[PDB]
Design a protein around this ligand. Sequence first.
Ligand code: 62U
Ligand code: 62U
Ligand code: NI
Ligand code: NI
Ligand code: NI
Ligand code: NI
Ligand code: NI
Ligand code: NI
Lengths: 213, 213
Amino acid sequence: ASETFEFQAEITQLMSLIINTVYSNKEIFLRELISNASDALDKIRYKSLSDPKQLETEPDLFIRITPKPEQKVLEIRDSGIGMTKAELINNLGTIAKSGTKAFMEALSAGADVSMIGQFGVGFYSLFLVADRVQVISKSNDDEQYIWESNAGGSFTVTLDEVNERIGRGTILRLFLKDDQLEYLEEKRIKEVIKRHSEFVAYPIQLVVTKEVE
Amino acid sequence: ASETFEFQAEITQLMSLIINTVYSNKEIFLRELISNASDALDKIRYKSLSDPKQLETEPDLFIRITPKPEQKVLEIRDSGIGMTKAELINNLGTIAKSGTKAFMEALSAGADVSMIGQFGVGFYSLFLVADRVQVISKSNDDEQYIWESNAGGSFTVTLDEVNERIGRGTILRLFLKDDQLEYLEEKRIKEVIKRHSEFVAYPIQLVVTKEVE
Ligand SMILES: COC1=C2C[C@@H](C)C[C@H](OC)[C@H](O)[C@H](C)/C=C(\C)[C@@H](OC(N)=O)[C@@H](OC)/C=C\C=C(/C)C(=O)NC(=C(c3ccco3)C1=O)C2=O
Ligand SMILES: COC1=C2C[C@@H](C)C[C@H](OC)[C@H](O)[C@H](C)/C=C(\C)[C@@H](OC(N)=O)[C@@H](OC)/C=C\C=C(/C)C(=O)NC(=C(c3ccco3)C1=O)C2=O
Ligand code: NI
Ligand code: NI
Ligand code: NI
Ligand code: NI
Ligand code: NI
Ligand code: NI
């Protein structure tokens, strides 16, 4: 029925630094979320070694990118390990994150945004291209939940009685900024993926809507 | 929380005649559901003439066909008028339907299955290719509901706390028979649509998943 949570202070700062920022190489947000997806797919594949039944909820391991042009939305789905309510809460904003400080200090010094991934806060690069995100997620150990943020000071978390059922995993639902609609285009997606996500152990799927004529 | 309803007797007979049937031209089920979609799109476009706000819930008028190969499922979506709980109940199985009798008598006499559409029971041709259907629907005048049938003697109707939100309209979710998986293939869909659905006033979209390599 949907709870509101406060962002740890530094995490709010990080998000502002990013959402309010010029910078050409915004395309990196795609490497970052594909990198996350991949990590999440590794984790369930590995968990499944001693627990084969964990795969039963969704046998197929993939990454799938669905531009929804109509809604100015882009979605990155993975059939990875997914995240519980508690995980969404703790890992995505309430708890003091590993390198949020360190990363901003590095930016102060002239570091390239590109590095965000190496500080373990790559997730937040999605604010380069988006003013709202929903992380929708289904872990084998909990119900499906939606974490939502507009880069403000808080996020909500809501039991998901609204989205298609993910069997297991996570959909990143990016509400793209108006200047950033190029990331809805098939050719632009293939380009970024080919150039900067060359070594991914899982198939990357791209959902394309074509009018039959 | 999901109610069970009985099929009017003749409607049960019709469904058996169809689901238990040889016959080459099964492809007609596609004409029939595209024909329905179109009718449903006409109806809201027309309703919108004196009530422009009816379009607000989903401004775009389209038909969209999404083969889900993984789940052996094919979906035909329309952004048409959609159907209420009561409508799903009355119009799709509990009430004595216009030409269900007449149509079966016509089949007894040697009529081609193709004609089902002209008896106003084309909907049931989907059992040519499918052993389970979910009709999921969102009318402007009610919540989203799922009507479900395996061709048996009954259907259920359930408040939809499980599927993506249709803004307005209907998704036909066909669980294809194992002999009928050709209707998952892009080329097969374009063929049937081009040959037998040549004159449709609305764009027909086909969702294709392609692996980026
Ligand atoms: C040491 O674990 C890792 C953490 C610490 C926890 C958050 C891990 C999570 O706990 C529940 C969980 O184990 C998930 C698998 C989470 C993943 C990676 C993502 O979700 C999925 N499923 O797509 C992502 O939301 C999309 C979640 C937040 C990640 C943020 C903050 C990051 O920028 N980076 C990050 C990692 C990483 C991997 C590759 C590049 O960076 C990473 O390995 C981490 O922060
Ligand atoms: C005189 O209205 C019509 C009826 C009688 C009522 C059912 C109408 C419905 O009441 C609420 C409603 O007005 C919807 C718009 C329903 C549509 C057409 C479909 O849903 C959508 N939205 O895709 C379909 O489920 C997919 C529903 C059942 C239809 C069956 C039984 C049919 O085989 N045929 C059929 C028509 C038809 C049109 C073209 C070819 O055949 C038709 O015009 C009819 O039965
Ligand atoms: Ni539009
Ligand atoms: Ni916007
Ligand atoms: Ni580049
Ligand atoms: Ni499979
Ligand atoms: Ni089956
Ligand atoms: Ni033909």
